[PDB]
Amino acid sequence: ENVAIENDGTPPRDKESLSPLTRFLNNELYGEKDARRKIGEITQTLLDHAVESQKVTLKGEVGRLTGYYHQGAASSGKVVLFLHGSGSSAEEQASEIRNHYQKQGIDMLAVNLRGYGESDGGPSEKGLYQDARTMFNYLVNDKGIDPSNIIIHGYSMGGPIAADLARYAAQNGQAVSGLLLDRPMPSMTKAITAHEVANPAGIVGAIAKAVNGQFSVEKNLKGLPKETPILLLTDNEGLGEEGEKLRAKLAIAGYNVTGEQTFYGHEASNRLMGQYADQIVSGLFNAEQAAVEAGEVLKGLEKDFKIRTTKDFLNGYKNDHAKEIVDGFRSDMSIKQLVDLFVKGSWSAEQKGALAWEIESRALKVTFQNKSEKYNRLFREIASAGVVDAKATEQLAPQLMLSDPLSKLVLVAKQLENDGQVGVARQLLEKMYSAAAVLSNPTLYSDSENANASKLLSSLAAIHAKNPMHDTSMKVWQEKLEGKQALTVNGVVEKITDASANGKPVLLELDAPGHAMAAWAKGSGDDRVYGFYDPNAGIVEFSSAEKFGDYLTRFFGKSDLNMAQSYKLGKNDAGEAIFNRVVVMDGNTLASYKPTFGDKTTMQGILDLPVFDA
Known part of the structure; x- marks a missing residue:
């Protein structure tokens, strides 16, 4: 099924083209036919110094895939698959980047996709992914690179494609070493409307609506093992702005996403690789992570x-x-x-x-990394056994190496989410991550964005100092189950799971003497999910009430993890664990609370604070 692929041949190069609309759409998406194939003479003159491996042609799915392979340097044996973006040839896009790997002693495979350079064919999404794999299959079989100490690289469009290939390699047991999303296209639709202006309704938006769910990085990465190191480097322009939005989605979801936003323009290869080459090549192995x-x-x-x-x-x-x-x-x-x-x-x-x-x-x-693997291990163990859960999620929510405030909010969100709105818990986390990046590098982002982040940061601080439980102007709780009316570990599972209410939220707050945690239920029927937030172990939701019990008891009890003893909470009459206090909270009251006297932004308003203006 995966044999050798090299093949030399020497005709001129083929094409596709269709109906005059789909032609001057394909032109808009991939570049004009001539622009795709032009190699500039100064590059060709430099590349005609394949006098010291250097020129390539592979058997593609729809024809030949021409290109070049570039050797290492004068002196530890690894290669960069390069997947190029749209608009220009592989030789032109690579010419700037091709040197910064070379000088370190890194090889690079710069091969054109169908319809580019001297490669036969016409560009196609399902096809371009196929051609990427051909290049891969040239690296392992034809040139027998060791299992995988190879990186993908990863470009505007090269990004979505790179992502897809990385998933295929893992799924097929040839798992690649690293992924590099270099100034990537988050999705075709968003790549079009970013470089064009705002959100028009005429042709630019009709194209965008046509090409929905194509070249989506997040969509292509679903399948990839989350451990796989992903380096995400964004441009300083609107595609980065949508790239950083993506970064947060990917972080929270739990991919191993490193890197930052650059201050270089989307076409400034030499300047970007100039800075980040070291960080890139130090970005594909695991100490590294120790360092x-x-x-x-x-x-x-x-x-x-x-x-x-x-x-x-x-x-x-x-x-x-x-x-x-x-x-x-x-x-x-x-x-x-x-x-x-x-x-x-x-x-x-x-x-x-x-x-x-x-x-x-x-x-x-x-605050966001690290997280101890046991908590990930426990989540994976619960999804594995039994009828695997459809909506079993896990979010790296910030771990406040410093809860008190988040735990108040996660519950506010689930009320809102029960009332028809959706994703706002997930969004909060992303916006907190986004706001962090903004405050932790202030110069890069705008005056307005620096200002907005310091309001989300301020609101978190204001909840820290002035607690809603330590407040008398209103009452945010229904009842406080404490003392000898205090709930056991399974007692928390029962209130959460009991379906004698099946259309209302259950919004608990689980108070250990050190840390203060939370747990919830929202939804309707099939959509009804049960969840739990620990400050230094992320968040989990399950739609299976039994799987919730499995996790939550294994989390606290001796059966697996035994995090009850370590969270320093006392035992009840029979000899089991019972939280100090357990608050059954009112969502609507809590959502109306304001932490600052004089400011009118409520807890629900804190949730809906912007970070990136748009």
């Missing part, structure tokens, strides 16, 4: 290094206020250098608040 774990626990030491109510501190807790009145501090410094700026000359009540925001805003991004 950033070390620098990770670094800032964990510096958090242990580390008034909240007093009016002076709150006057200084905001963006760009430290840069005026606190000397010694630059805006480009690390947390290591900012926390050291705290302990040099130690400051007034207002100046301490100014550094607090500046430190805790950088800190937000560091």
Whole structure:
């Protein structure tokens, strides 16, 4: 089924083309026929120095797939499959990037897809994925690269394609080493309307509506093992803006997504590869992860290094206020250098608040990784056994190396989600991740976006200081099951699972003496799902009430994980665990609460705060 593929041949090159609409759609999608094939003479002159492997032609599914293979350098034996984007030839797109791998001693396979360069055929989505695999099958069979220490690379469109290939390789047991989404197209539809302006309704939107669900990175990645390292590097233009939106979706879903947003334009290959080549080639193996774990626990030491109510501190807790009145501090410094700026000359009540925001805003991004594998293992064990669950989700929700606030909110969301709205729990997390990236690199993103993130950050802080349970103006709870009316572990499963209500939400808050957790039920009939948020173990939902019981008991009890003992909560009369307190909460009351006196944004308004303006 997967034999050798090399084949030389020397005719001129074939084509497709159809009905005059679909022609000047295909032109819009993939580039004009001539533009696809033009190789510029300066490149050809350089490539005509295949005088020191260097030229390639493979048997594609609809014809020949021409291109070039590029050797390593003067001196640890690995290759970059390069999948090119639309608009130009593979030789032109690669010419800029082809050198930065070369000099490190990395090979690269730059092969054209159907309809590009000198390759036979006409561009087609199902076909372009097929041609990508041909290039892959040239690397392992024809040139026998070791199982897989190869990276995909990964481009505008090359991205969606790269994603698809990476899934096929894994599914077929030839699992590739790394994926690189280099300034990628999130989806064809969104790639069109981004480079064009806003959201027109004429032809540009008719094309977009036509090409819906084509070249979708998230859609092509579903199937890929989540451990597979993905490096996602975005441009500074509107395709990055949609790329960073994607990044968050991919992070929360749980893919191994690294990288940042660049400040380079979508066509600026040489400048981007100029900076990121090191980070890219250090991005395909696993220590690596040890080397950033070390620098990770670094800032964990510096958090242990580390008034909240007093009016002076709150006057200084905001963006760009430290840069005026606190000397010694630059805006480009690390947390290591900012926390050291705290302990040099130690400051007034207002100046301490100014550094607090500046430190805790950088800190937000560091809350999301890591997560201990046991919690992922336990989630996978529950989905595996029995009738596998359709809506079994898992979200990397921020773990606040610092809950108190999130746990209040996750419940607000599920009320809203029960009332017909949907995804807002998931969206909150993404927006928190997005806001982190914005605050943790302030220069890149706009004045407005820096401002919006510091409002979501502010709202989280305001819930931290002023709790709804510690409040008298309204009552956000229905009842408090504590004392000898306190619920057992299975007692929480019963209130959540009991279907004597089948159209209403069950919004619990599970209070251990250290950490404060939550759990819920929403939905109608088939859609009815039961869920649980732990601060330092992410979120899980299941639509099978039995699978919820399996997880939740294995989470706390001795059967598997035994996280009850470790979460330091006392035993009941028979000798089992019972939470300190268990709040059955009112969603509508809680959703109307405002954390700041003077500000009119409610808990539901906090959920719907923007981060990226649009």
